[PDB]
A paper describes a structure:
Enzyme rhodopsins comprise the N-terminal rhodopsin domain and C-terminal enzyme domain, connected by a linker, and function as light-activated enzymes. Rh-PDE derived from Salpingoeca rosetta (SrRh-PDE) was first identified and exhibits light-dependent hydrolytic activity for both of cAMP and cGMP, whereas it lacks pump or channel activity. SrRh-PDE consists of the long N-terminal region, transmembrane domain (TMD), including the rhodopsin domain, C-terminal PDE domain, and 76-residue linker region connecting the TMD and PDE domain. Here, we present crystal structures of SrRh-PDE–TMD with and without the linker region, at 3.5 and 2.6 Å resolutions, respectively.
We next determined the 2.1 Å resolution crystal structure of the PDE domain with the linker region (Linker–PDE, residues 347–703). The N-terminal residues Lys380–Met386 are newly observed as compared with the reported structure, while residues 347–379 are disordered. The Ala385 backbone amide forms a hydrogen bond with the Glu478 sidechain, fixing the N-terminal residues and extending toward the dimer interface. The TMD–Linker and Linker–PDE structures provided insights into their connectivity, but there is no observed density to assign residues 354–379 in the linker region. The C-terminal residues 380–386 in the third α-helix were unwound, as similarly in our Linker–PDE structure.
Numbering used by the authors:
A (entry chain A), B (entry chain A): 380 to 708
The structure:
Amino acid sequence: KGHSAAMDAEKLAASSLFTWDFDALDKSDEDLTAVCVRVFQELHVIEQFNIDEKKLRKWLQKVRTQYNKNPFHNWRHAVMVLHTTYLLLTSVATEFITEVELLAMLIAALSHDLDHNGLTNAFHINSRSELALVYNDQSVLENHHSHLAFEILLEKGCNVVENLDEDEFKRLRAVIINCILNTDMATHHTKLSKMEEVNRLGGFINLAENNDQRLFVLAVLLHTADLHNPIKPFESNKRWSARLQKEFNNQVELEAKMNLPSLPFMRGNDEESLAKGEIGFINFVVKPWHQQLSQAFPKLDFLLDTIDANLAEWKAIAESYRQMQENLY
Amino acid sequence: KGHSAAMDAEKLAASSLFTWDFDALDKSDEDLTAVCVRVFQELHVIEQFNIDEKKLRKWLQKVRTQYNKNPFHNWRHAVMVLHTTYLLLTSVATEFITEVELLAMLIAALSHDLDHNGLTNAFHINSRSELALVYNDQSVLENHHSHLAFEILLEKGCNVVENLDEDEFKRLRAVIINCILNTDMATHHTKLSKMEEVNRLGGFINLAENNDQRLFVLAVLLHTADLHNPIKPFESNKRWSARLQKEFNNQVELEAKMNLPSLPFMRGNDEESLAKGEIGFINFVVKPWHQQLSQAFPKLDFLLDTIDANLAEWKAIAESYRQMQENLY
Ligand SMILES: [Mg+2]
Ligand SMILES: [Mg+2]
Ligand SMILES: [Zn+2]
Ligand SMILES: [Zn+2]
């Protein structure tokens, strides 16, 4: 029965947990567990919902065991999205997000890629996979992730939301479903267009009262945290991007063995292809997204300087390879 | 006094001997003898060097009696490496290998693991064995194999190279020594790095004239044939891998009785440990090796599809055991 969640951003930002340079690749298994628990603890959701910390840790374990050992879409990617969501909500959402929606964003971020196998939605649709048949080609993977999120959560020993009442769980369920389904890259352009129209009209007006407009912002922020590669230091940008390229190469190899069409961008398997793909992805997807995001939330415009520094680095790598490839001609 | 060995790959590939599905475990003792003789006969080395077939058969017998009844490193493993070497040379080497080097590759492949006792080089060095003292910790087993190869060969009734002149035997001896010594797994990474640099420069250029570069390729090919497990049908992959695991388990048992350190990968003695070890060995050793090999010799890239099929099979086995082990937690 509160107006907004119990958060003071400046106390939260003073913690050693608050660092935009966080990279799960440099953390051990026990370190990642501590990060997830610390996010829940420092955001006060454990005490606000009387969360059994034995169920929280059991739920965390069950979440990790349902992620697969993929190069990119793995348990460390989930923790990266959880931690980045914690950074984004602390920066801009402290005064309109509710307590239940805050708990929902933490669960959704950690659960958003459950049981990923390093294959894209196009593979499932083209191969007519069992998952594609279940979901009738509609956001196949994201529907699968959200389903397993609740199958794991509603289990008795992992029920971290056991103390929520009917109305609170209904809102938590709606927030998790909408935010995970909006991690589908096929819905990126629609959210970008709506953000542009909102920015044309001056911006968001009283988010604490407009429930549907507040949910849109939460979906926008989780999608932002999902694309964490270009907003991290370049060493983090390069290691994760090289891991995604490995998944792309494995899919093309599987698609050829199954006589399925492949997209030409996924075929590149060297450093020059990596840099060229990152330049295009940043110039046409990430940068226009954060330009609209920084206009609605100017506190986040420092991310544009991180995106530009990484973009300048990838262009230096591409220029070196092109300078070596032009001499053949 | 020839430019290259007298071989036409397409005539050779039409023989019933040419089959990548060959497995020595399914052959009788007399069948294996016939396979070894047929390799020598069909490659024309018997007539090219006027080989006394009574000495060839006596040499074959003496080779077999110097192999021990190990689960993996036995006489059938030697025939597997001989036959796989015959497949590899027929596929890619017909136009640069010389007649003497061809005969040397057949002898080296059959002799490459002589008097193996199912124990690794690390055991000899750690136990300060007599063999480790003889060879000053340098490629202990491989030096031992090559020594016995010539002790068996230079015997009068087994001298299959009696008709070679001085220059031809000197090259044959150099090829056998270098190729057997390069079966030392401790030299795998160095050969992989050189193959990567050669592939960066466009590939091998006129191997028929560069003697040292041609010897490197022969060493690369014999090492390829030594690791025949992942490039065979899965039933062959599993039976031989289970035999190697038995040797690993026997060594750890011997090392504990002698108060010697043991590597943790050798302790696994069940099917789940077998699958986990094969996935790691294929992902980090075999697959990167054949990716470089297929880039220098694209005719061999079908082996990558065999490696992937076996890798997918081992991952299905590991997933079943993990799905049964995660429910305890
Ligand atoms: Mg996803
Ligand atoms: Mg050996
Ligand atoms: Zn994701
Ligand atoms: Zn061997």
